[PDB]
Design a protein around this ligand. Structure first.
Ligand SMILES: O=C(O)c1ccnc(C(=O)O)c1
Ligand SMILES: [Mn+2]
Length: 228
C-alpha cells in the first residue's frame, strides 16, 4: 500500500500514531522551505564542496575523489559506471552546508542527545540502488533534489526477506526487491509492504529497524537524520 502523507503533524500526533507504533509516514510542509531546497544546484555544490574529498561507492568498490571529480565522472559526462556519494557525513566535513538544513523538531521526541544525531548525505545520479536493509535507529530521510522510489517492509516480515547469514550483513536482505528470485526466495512474493515516490521537500520517517530499499529516479540528493 501507500505511505501516508501528513502536513506538519503535531509532535503528539506523530509520537502516538507513528513513532511509538513504528509506522512510516511522509511529513509535508516541514522541510519544504529549508534553504537547501532552493540553493543546492550542481553549481552551488561545486562552489562550496568541489575541492573536498568524498567517499564514493562504485558499482562493488569504495574509492575517494573530490566532489568535482565525482560530478564530472559520475553525474554529467555520460557516466561509464554507477557512482554514489553515499552515507557520508558531509555536513560535519563542510559546516557551511549545515546552514542550509535543520534538525527536525520531531527528533526531540527521542531519548538520545541531539549532538549524537548522525546526518548523512546521499548524492548520486539516476539509478542508484540501495538494497533492502534495516538500520538500528529511527530515521528522517529528507529529499532535496530529484525523486526516489522507496519500498518498506516491517520488521515483522524479516522471515520473508532472507537476511544474509553473516553478522556483518545480517541487516541486509539477500533478495533483489525489484527482480526477486522466487525460486530461491519464495516467501518474498507474499510479504506485504508500503512504497512511495519521495519528492523534493518531503521527509520520509523510517521507523527503527524498518526494512527499506531505495532507487533514485533522477539526479538525486537526500539528507538522512539517524536519531534515537
Ligand atoms: O537514499 C539512499 O540511497 C539510502 C540508502 C540506505 N539508507 C538510507 C538511509 O537514510 O538510511 C538511504
Ligand atoms: Mn538505511
Amino acid at each position: 500500500s501507500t505511505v501516508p502523507r501528513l502536513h506538519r503533524p503535531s509532535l503528539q500526533h506523530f509520537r502516538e500514531q507513528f513513532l511509538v507504533p513504528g509506522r512510516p509516514v511522509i511529513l509535508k510542509g516541514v522541510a519544504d522551505h529549508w534553504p537547501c531546497m532552493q540553493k543546492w544546484s550542481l553549481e552551488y555544490i561545486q562552489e562550496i564542496a568541489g575541492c573536498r574529498t568524498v567517499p564514493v561507492e562504485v558499482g562493488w568498490s569504495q574509492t575517494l575523489m573530490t566532489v568535482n571529480e565525482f560530478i564530472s565522472k559520475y553525474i554529467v559526462n555520460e557516466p561509464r559506471d554507477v557512482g554514489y556519494l553515499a552515507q557520508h557525513q558531509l555536513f560535519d566535513q563542510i559546516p557551511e552546508l549545515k546552514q542550509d538544513i535543520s534538525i527536525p523538531d520531531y527528533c526531540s521526541l527521542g531519548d538520545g542527545e541531539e549532538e549524537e544525531i548522525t546526518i548523512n548525505a546521499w548524492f548520486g545520479p539516476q539509478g542508484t540502488i540501495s538494497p533492502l536493509h534495516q538500520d538500528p535507529q529511527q530515521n528522517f530521510l529528507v529529499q532535496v533534489m530529484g525523486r526516489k522510489y522507496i519500498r518498506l517492509y516491517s520488521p515483522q516480515e524479516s522471515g520473508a526477506l532472507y537476511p544474509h547469514d553473516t553478522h556483518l550483513l545480517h541487516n541486509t536482505s539477500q533478495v533483489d526487491v525489484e527482480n526477486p528470485d522466487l525460486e530461491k526466495f519464495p516467501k518474498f512474493a507474499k510479504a506485504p509492504f508500503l512504497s512511495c515516490i519521495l519528492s523534493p521537500g518531503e521527509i520520509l520517517f523510517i521507523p527503527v529497524k524498518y526494512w527499506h530499499y531505495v532507487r533514485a529516479l533522477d539526479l538525486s540528493f537526500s539528507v538522512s537524520f539517524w536519531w534515537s
